[PDB]
Design a protein around this ligand. Structure first.
Ligand SMILES: *[C@@H]1O[C@H](CO)[C@@H](O[C@@H]2O[C@H](CO)[C@@H](O)[C@H](O)[C@H]2NC(C)=O)[C@H](O)[C@H]1NC(C)=O
Ligand SMILES: *[C@@H]1O[C@H](CO)[C@@H](O[C@@H]2O[C@H](CO)[C@@H](O)[C@H](O)[C@H]2NC(C)=O)[C@H](O)[C@H]1NC(C)=O
Ligand SMILES: *[C@@H]1O[C@H](CO)[C@@H](O[C@@H]2O[C@H](CO)[C@@H](O)[C@H](O)[C@H]2NC(C)=O)[C@H](O)[C@H]1NC(C)=O
Ligand SMILES: *[C@@H]1O[C@H](CO)[C@@H](O)[C@H](O)[C@H]1NC(C)=O
Ligand SMILES: *[C@@H]1O[C@H](CO)[C@@H](O)[C@H](O)[C@H]1NC(C)=O
Ligand SMILES: *[C@@H]1O[C@H](CO)[C@@H](O)[C@H](O)[C@H]1NC(C)=O
Ligand SMILES: *[C@@H]1O[C@H](CO)[C@@H](O)[C@H](O)[C@H]1NC(C)=O
Ligand SMILES: *[C@@H]1O[C@H](CO)[C@@H](O)[C@H](O)[C@H]1NC(C)=O
Ligand SMILES: *[C@@H]1O[C@H](CO)[C@@H](O)[C@H](O)[C@H]1NC(C)=O
Ligand SMILES: *[C@@H]1O[C@H](CO)[C@@H](O)[C@H](O)[C@H]1NC(C)=O
Ligand SMILES: *[C@@H]1O[C@H](CO)[C@@H](O)[C@H](O)[C@H]1NC(C)=O
Ligand SMILES: *[C@@H]1O[C@H](CO)[C@@H](O)[C@H](O)[C@H]1NC(C)=O
Ligand SMILES: *[C@@H]1O[C@H](CO)[C@@H](O)[C@H](O)[C@H]1NC(C)=O
Ligand SMILES: *[C@@H]1O[C@H](CO)[C@@H](O)[C@H](O)[C@H]1NC(C)=O
Ligand SMILES: *[C@@H]1O[C@H](CO)[C@@H](O)[C@H](O)[C@H]1NC(C)=O
Ligand SMILES: *[C@@H]1O[C@H](CO)[C@@H](O)[C@H](O)[C@H]1NC(C)=O
Ligand SMILES: *[C@@H]1O[C@H](CO)[C@@H](O)[C@H](O)[C@H]1NC(C)=O
Ligand SMILES: *[C@@H]1O[C@H](CO)[C@@H](O)[C@H](O)[C@H]1NC(C)=O
Ligand SMILES: *[C@@H]1O[C@H](CO)[C@@H](O)[C@H](O)[C@H]1NC(C)=O
Ligand SMILES: *[C@@H]1O[C@H](CO)[C@@H](O)[C@H](O)[C@H]1NC(C)=O
Ligand SMILES: *[C@@H]1O[C@H](CO)[C@@H](O)[C@H](O)[C@H]1NC(C)=O
Ligand SMILES: *[C@@H]1O[C@H](CO)[C@@H](O)[C@H](O)[C@H]1NC(C)=O
Ligand SMILES: *[C@@H]1O[C@H](CO)[C@@H](O)[C@H](O)[C@H]1NC(C)=O
Ligand SMILES: *[C@@H]1O[C@H](CO)[C@@H](O)[C@H](O)[C@H]1NC(C)=O
Lengths: 491, 491, 491
């Protein structure tokens, strides 16, 4: 009672969280934050990216001009969304390397089309069918021109169209494969048929194939679709002795941030930077477990469902420096205004006060980690396909392998980051506790002794103002030294 | 002699191991463990994966039905093993995109075949050759049906087969290329020949090519092999005016964990999760240097031949805290029952005792690292090919680049992991030593002084029970304080 | 004045550098080094790699034998450099899968050509044109043999050439597509034309296409180029009924470290291991921001423009241990012969001296980090293409995705490495300061007291030799103990 006690300590909470570190799979800290985004709100937000809902139409069908897709003429998009309900309702067609055409168009992000005046002297234009009805009338693909004989003759065509512009031109055309020799004659007079379209730097030579195929909406014939790009100063050359499905012009082709995504999520009236096929997701977290397919500023896809980053010290209710969960037996749940602090006992009673500077020092370092990790995602736009509806073999094997490789490496980075950061967070918080203890010890000089549990026995009368002077660094040890020494070194 | 000495210390071994850290390329620790698996037992274990030894047959030959491979009918596998000795002994064939067909079949993991009753009215079935002898008789591919003229005529075929099942069907067929017009007439009556097989969603149009090729086992003609997949509700349509090598049904196609591997390792009667072409390897280590080609739960392939993870403190015979290899001059090889401990000298003699708690604290942390690294490998099944027998160019360049990229990134992860873990292991062991020293110092209060080399000079008579009381935390400093103070502060 | 003062401290500089750590985006250290190479000297050094400047010729043109490229016959290279100014000046040609042929040749690294004596009995050899003028004379591709009719007939050819060597043979050949039926007859007599070349393991069947294409240097006809590889014991078989552009032999095909690069950088007379299209770059740094396209021992491409690795302690003008920027208020700019040291005040004056051992300990650890990072780059040769002149779709998407994936992962590794190393460097330097302080404290025993700011109050007369004895570890505390104790414990 001619003495006082000053104890150094740290806070603790009743509701701790378990995190992983380098040396321990399960250790409890006072607080943590989730680094893996695991949920979507179920909608694709129409902002801030220009969304184009394909609805009943695939991109290709909108490109070709299926009457159902007339409203899509000359549209632009950041992201084209293909629905699973979609279907074609015009003339049956196939595209060799469909995926590549779909990709380059999607990446271009526009359906801007210019009509071109080709000299088709000698044939009947605007061919038409009952499988492709527009406004209740028999029609055809809006961007394609079906040619037939004129007066039972089909001369050889030798048509050119030069690109005298500053931009590339994208031409879409096709070859008809009638189901019967009868039809071949009826349409084109000739028995054979042959198409050759060229530029200075390419030749595409197609020979049509008469034959029956299983009927799609009761049609056994097919059209095969092809494309060719013509650059400034180059020229398109179309030769045909029949069966040519002609273009009515070219598509502009651009480069930018545009792409395409398969999803059934409804479009919402909302704003979100990151889009997945499950719907838009927040991008505050550095990682996500929602979908490997993303568009925009998105967290990186990892395999883990959860990864907790410690944002507080080790929770000890009741480190390398050995203070927290070391020589300090437990934390103080009763300390709610700081992370580290002082408890005392003197002649005037018992008290508790937080230390702000040490509290702030730990908090600043932890916020430093958060700033490196939170709200710093990276933009990706058109990528590769990551889900497949048909077996393809070699190329699909490679595409799958590349993505699986990427995911495991990022999943590794995420796991290690958290383990390392959490080990370091537990150690830096232990460190700040030790620094405060060490500083206090030096302040007291020869006037106190370390009891070994974070507490100092102060060998002199130390009232509330004295204790306060210790806590704010104005304690003058020389004032009490004589009193303390006599108390310390007696019998 | 009115005094005692208590020294704090750590163990050391005569046989240390050199490891790498962040700051030092070569530092000696008491013990380490190897993280890179560098050897195989030379056999492929037949457990726990269903192994199928191709022996003399490639997967394709077993698929087609080379008589040599009759025993493989309807087999399933987790892993198909292709031998280098393998060879074909039927009709000479090629497969365009051989690699893709090989892959999809291998990935499917089954040769389950259902026979289908096609209406081949108008032709001769079960064509046969002297190049493909079965049971000493001239025969053909068991799954293929070679059609020829009936009564010197070959009408146009228009055969359909609908998929009215719940699963996909895999059809294998082929086109014959006779070496002579003479043979073309003899077999098919017609001079030309043409094959067209279709579904609702595809057309494969082949035009046979009469001509001579270098003779394979004395045959100058060839067959080209093709495949088509037919889904539920779709239909196969086969049109031919000759040369058609017909299917006798379909293969079931599955999806799962199946794959194929090229190896000459014998199959052993043993159990091992990880398979390489060199043979099975243990998967206790996180990394391996045996082969980039793996199947099953395998360690990851890295370029390093060795990577030592420290599992013990720095070995000092004769860290950031400066105790081990610091103010403590060297370790004690004579301490074999603990990592840290006490040596004393008093009136009753000289002694040594291990400290269990500090020893266990270091060991637990090191075992924590091991648990994160040991026995946690990840399963991979069908991947991409990683060795190539022919020059192919672009696609092979990409396949090689992808794998080389993956390997360097994992090799980087492995090198950094070990360097970081070892720096941390050396530091945590130094830390535990410092904690024990610090705790002991506080226990002694004013009764001892730090001699600066890990030893305390105790300023009072301290017999074996006294020393023991210090080592187990029951030392009451107040009992000796008067004696110690008088000895300390004298002239 | 019956007392002395000894202060422990560290250096500081007027010109600090800002680096990144784990907990702080901007912290100042005494010195740092740049890890990202950001510049080129603008030239491609001709050493130590064998450089081949294509000049006006592409690799393919040098392969085929455009007269402009005659000087390139049988050349070898480590790296072939294609200029953008390059152009073809012979017969107009295309190569299907041009990129793959370009790649395999570049990777082979040689134009070594052996002439072979084919039996072309029945046709006219050495066909020639006005589009391909050699020495002012009409000529053709030096490695190709243009065949025409002899006496208005073109019989069927059935020529073989066996590989009875120990190495592979690379055959280059072509198919002519005349612009008119008139030309077809004039050259080959026959109206059709057909080419079939085979080995035991392959068939390439081409059917020429008569037709007009936009004129290249006033030629509307084209040649299509093809290749086939023939292995030891295999045989080439060439069948043609016209239009065959024949080979005059084979190219040797090798495997090794050869590749090709597109660049307009001039070749310099200098020595540098790493080549980019911007020019050669030094490879002392582990990372570079110059170009994703590299050849040789090169730093890895990252997205960051700068990454500073700390090579010195925290700069404090005027850590986890709390010494530097902690209880030691600031550094000493006046200390230029060491990183850590002593300042004293006694009866003889005031002094400063560096401590070498602690200085060297920090420096050695930092040099350890540098040795792991500096001058350890890895060799890469032929890779994949990373810039593209035409839209291609699927395969190009994959090639771009693979490279973008690789770059982000390395950029991540680089950012984390630096943040981790810098946090550790700041901590280890703080640690060495603390060790020196701790060691000094123990030396002084009961003869001094810690003033809490790195300074000791020494309670006895301590002249220059005494202070010196403290700095070099020969201070005998027992000599001054009586004097110090009486001064310490008085009233
Ligand atoms: C080849 O066979 C198919 C299948 O029998 C024929 O296609 C059918 O034609 C009938 C009428 O001719 C239609 O009612 C069916 O819907 C068709 N089925 C399919 C799957 O398309 C086809 O006409 C035959 N080819 C020839 C030339 O006769
Ligand atoms: C084209 O030439 C090849 C090579 O001479 C011929 O193939 C050979 O035919 C003879 C008998 O006719 C066999 O003994 C050889 O083994 C064959 N060699 C090869 C490599 O196949 C081929 O017959 C010729 N073609 C024609 C139509 O005569
Ligand atoms: C097909 O049309 C093209 C374009 O008019 C013709 O090519 C031109 O031919 C004239 C002389 O005949 C040349 O002066 C031009 O330079 C050619 N232009 C191009 C782009 O090649 C071609 O001759 C026509 N084909 C036929 C068979 O008449
Ligand atoms: C702990 O409880 C408080 C009070 O409800 C709450 O604010 C805090 O988020 C909780 N922490 C965790 C990790 O649940
Ligand atoms: C837990 O940590 C996060 C991140 O710093 C913070 O937003 C949250 O307020 C913390 N919770 C408490 C109860 O302090
Ligand atoms: C889409 O097609 C369905 C037919 O299945 C039709 O009911 C619906 O009205 C169509 N929607 C649009 C926007 O055309
Ligand atoms: C063909 O139809 C289009 C509109 O559908 C029209 O612009 C064009 O003039 C028509 N051509 C002929 C020859 O009728
Ligand atoms: C293909 O099959 C049907 C029925 O014979 C028809 O399209 C045609 O006759 C066949 N092909 C040829 C080339 O005859
Ligand atoms: C997102 O969709 C995929 C299927 O495309 C599904 O496996 C996954 O569970 C979904 N995620 C969420 C959070 O709904
Ligand atoms: C320190 O505490 C004492 C005691 O309460 C008080 O009088 C003094 O103003 C404080 N000093 C500072 C700088 O806060
Ligand atoms: C050191 O020697 C002991 C005794 O033979 C042995 O058990 C231990 O494995 C050895 N350590 C190394 C790294 O060889
Ligand atoms: C060396 O470390 C490994 C891993 O902890 C352990 O299995 C082995 O027993 C250790 N060796 C000795 C001699 O302690
Ligand atoms: C494999 O083929 C060889 C011929 O080289 C033969 O000796 C052996 O018996 C064959 N093995 C089997 C299992 O058919
Ligand atoms: C053809 O042979 C198979 C068995 O090899 C037999 O099942 C089938 O009935 C035969 N067909 C004819 C027409 O002989
Ligand atoms: C191909 O070469 C041989 C020998 O002439 C034969 O198969 C055939 O006659 C040739 N091809 C043609 C189309 O004549
Ligand atoms: C495994 O096989 C590869 C060749 O496929 C060889 O390079 C490697 O050295 C082998 N490894 C072992 C451990 O035998
Ligand atoms: C501590 O050591 C003393 C001296 O040997 C012994 O008497 C006592 O039982 C020990 N206490 C414990 C808790 O082990
Ligand atoms: C600081 O200044 C000195 C003297 O000019 C110089 O040697 C050193 O490189 C400078 N450091 C930096 C980071 O500029
Ligand atoms: C800065 O650090 C680098 C790397 O250690 C060194 O080359 C350079 O000399 C240092 N600068 C000074 C002024 O020490
Ligand atoms: C390259 O071609 C240009 C023509 O544009 C010519 O002036 C130059 O001399 C050529 N250089 C060589 C080395 O042939
Ligand atoms: C064709 O020309 C080459 C050289 O250009 C010559 O070696 C060869 O003998 C010539 N052949 C004939 C048939 O003139
Ligand atoms: C292709 O166009 C031109 C002009 O008619 C010519 O090459 C040829 O006649 C055409 N093709 C065919 C097969 O007639
Ligand atoms: C190198 O060239 C690329 C274009 O190929 C350019 O973007 C980059 O800025 C160049 N780098 C330097 C350092 O000149
Ligand atoms: C230590 O310093 C003293 C005082 O200057 C000097 O006499 C002595 O030689 C030094 N000892 C060593 C080993 O340097």
């Amino acid at each position: 009672n001619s003495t006082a006690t000053l104890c150094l300590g740290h806070h603790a909470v009743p509701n701790g969280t378990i995190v992983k570190t380098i040396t321990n799979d399960q250790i409890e800290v006072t607080n943590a934050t989730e680094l893996v985004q695991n949920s979507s709100i179920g909608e694709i937000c129409d902002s801030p990216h220009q969304i184009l809902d394909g609805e009943n139409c695939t991109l290709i069908d909108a490109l070709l001009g299926d009457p159902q897709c007339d409203g899509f003429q000359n549209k632009k998009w950041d992201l084209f969304v293909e629905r699973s309900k979609a279907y074609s309702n015009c003339y049956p067609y196939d595209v060799p390397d469909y995926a590549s055409l779909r990709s380059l168009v999607a990446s271009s992000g526009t359906l801007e089309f210019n009509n071109e005046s080709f000299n088709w002297t000698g044939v009947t234009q605007n061919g038409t069918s009952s499988a492709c009805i527009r406004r209740s009338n028999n029609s055809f693909f809006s961007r394609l021109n079906w040619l037939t004989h004129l007066n039972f003759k089909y001369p050889a065509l030798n048509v050119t169209m030069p690109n005298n512009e500053q931009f590339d031109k994208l031409y879409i055309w096709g070859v008809h494969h009638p189901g019967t020799d009868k039809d071949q004659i009826f349409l084109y007079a000739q028995s054979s048929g042959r198409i050759t379209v060229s530029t200075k730097r390419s030749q595409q030579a197609v020979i049509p194939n008469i034959g029956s195929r299983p009927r799609i909406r009761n049609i056994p014939s097919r059209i095969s679709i092809y494309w060719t790009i013509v650059k400034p100063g180059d020229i398109l050359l179309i030769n045909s002795t029949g069966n040519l499905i002609a273009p009515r012009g070219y598509f502009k082709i651009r480069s930018g941030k545009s792409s395409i995504m398969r999803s059934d999520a409804p479009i919402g009236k909302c704003n979100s930077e990151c889009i997945t096929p499950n719907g838009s997701i927040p991008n505050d977290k550095p990682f996500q477990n929602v979908n490997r397919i993303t568009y925009g500023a998105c967290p990186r896809y990892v395999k883990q469902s959860t990864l907790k980053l410690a944002t507080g010290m080790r929770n000890v209710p009741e480190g390398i420096f050995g203070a927290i969960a070391g020589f300090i037996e437990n934390g103080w749940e009763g300390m709610v205004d700081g992370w580290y602090g002082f408890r005392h006992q003197n002649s005037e009673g018992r008290g508790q006060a937080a230390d702000l500077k040490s509290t702030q020092a730990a908090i600043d370092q932890i916020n430093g980690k958060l700033n490196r990790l939170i709200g710093k995602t990276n933009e990706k736009f058109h990528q590769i396909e990551k889900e497949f509806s048909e077996v393809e073999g070699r190329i699909q094997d490679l595409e799958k392998y590349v993505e699986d490789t990427k995911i495991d490496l990022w999943s590794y980075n995420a796991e290690l980051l958290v383990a390392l950061e959490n080990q370091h967070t537990i150690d830096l918080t232990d460190s700040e506790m030790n620094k405060l203890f060490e500083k206090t010890k030096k302040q007291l000089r020869e006037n106190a002794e370390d009891m070994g549990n974070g507490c100092f026995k102060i060998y002199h009368k130390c009232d509330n103002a004295c204790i306060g002077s210790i806590r704010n660094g104005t304690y003058d040890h020389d004032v009490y030294r004589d009193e303390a020494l006599n108390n310390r070194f007696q019998i």
